[PDB]
Design a protein around this ligand. Sequence first.
Ligand SMILES: [Cl-]
Ligand SMILES: [K+]
Lengths: 282, 282
Amino acid sequence: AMTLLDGKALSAKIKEELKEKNQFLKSKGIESCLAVILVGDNPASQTYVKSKAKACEECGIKSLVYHLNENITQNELLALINTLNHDDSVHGILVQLPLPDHICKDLILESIISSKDVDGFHPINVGYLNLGLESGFLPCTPLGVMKLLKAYEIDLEGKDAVIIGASNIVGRPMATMLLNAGATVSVCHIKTKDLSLYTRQADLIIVAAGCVNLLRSDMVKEGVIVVDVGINRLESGKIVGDVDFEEVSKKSSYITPVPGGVGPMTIAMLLENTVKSAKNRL
Amino acid sequence: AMTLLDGKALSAKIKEELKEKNQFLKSKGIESCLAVILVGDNPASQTYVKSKAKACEECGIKSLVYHLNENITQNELLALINTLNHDDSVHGILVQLPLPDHICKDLILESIISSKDVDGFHPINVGYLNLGLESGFLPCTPLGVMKLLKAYEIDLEGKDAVIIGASNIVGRPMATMLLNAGATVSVCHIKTKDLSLYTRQADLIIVAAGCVNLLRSDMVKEGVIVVDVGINRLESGKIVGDVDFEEVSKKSSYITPVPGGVGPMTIAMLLENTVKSAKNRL
Ligand SMILES: [Cl-]
Ligand SMILES: [K+]
């Protein structure tokens, strides 16, 4: 039996739950508010910001989008975040990546007040998660994967999990959450000698490589759980992930489709982290 | 052709380097100082603290030992740490583990100011390492292994590494440093279904699980590099590690002995992190 991990349906349910929560919060004087900072006119990044703003409106979160020029200085971005850090009506601060070459990503993300770091990228929020303390802000993409697996009651302790990709956005916090859940984790990347050596043994595979058809049926055992984080656009217009879905799904017990899988869960956790920040301010 | 990873020999060379650094720092008015907080009367902890204070004296580090009552309250311990936090003459603050049962270790370690956290346990220093940055302090035990492996010119890029144990002291920061160095890392523990599936393919094994003879010769391939962090006392009083040394060393290209391996390297990094903090005053 194979089951699709329908992140699209789960994300819509979470949005409906947050809309109800925000109505109760609004009736008590708290209007959940997320500030999104976009530096530049990148067409893809503008699409991501519109998706977040549209998702905020659907669950009652007030959106503050700052479209800044590509040529703005690092000090001007720091000044805006400092103003947002002390704005009590703002509960979440998200900086859309990537930033221009003349603006240091590490300095900008650390300047966000950790109590509004809904992306979970501040060093102290990374440290909290790595210490097994899942109380603070968790990165949205791996958190959405965990919430999607929990929605199907996927028991994770003892499972052999393989993480393909070791980025701060997905890979590293993903392996930490799985490790916190009692699973055995293997972190692979572009320097791994034999990727199929690890994937052939895995009970759970999370692919965040950004490569079309990286995961094939050859490298998969029967009953594997496959989580596809990739969002790749074919030149034929079709959106696909990092997994050969048509063949890998035939050997999978659970698998995320693309589109409709991890994508919507990443946005839902952003809204959830925002409402969490607003609810912790009563 | 097994080669012993002589941590005792490398540690003595590091202390000689620190002795020259402290003579220079003292000439600039900087007397490197480490404060050690010992709570209770655990006989093993007393021995470790004396060993630390002795190692400080050998390389020109001023040691301050604070011996607190076993029944000290949590806020009383926090008050001392706050005093040491604002003491400009103190460059490093270490809390000897284990603390009494009525003391929350995580809350105590987070109260240490991160610029004097020579153990690298503060959440923001854990975050810096997990983000791939070396701006903070690194935990002494995994840092010592990295320095020990570097001294023997062992290339870690692309190597299949397996870490057994996932503690905040050793296992988790070790996997991050190996991942930052470009190795493929697998974190195993008590919930792993079959440790041998991971260890038999490993080029490098870090064992820190607190169990005698956990790593056997038949769980290992020829040419493996073995690092034994375990310090276990048998019924006879003999100190051994987590590795069956007699059998595993026959298949190992490099292996740490116990004693004389990771142990002295852990203390050497404590001293080195303290001189590193004192150098920041320059
Ligand atoms: Cl602007
Ligand atoms: K790859």
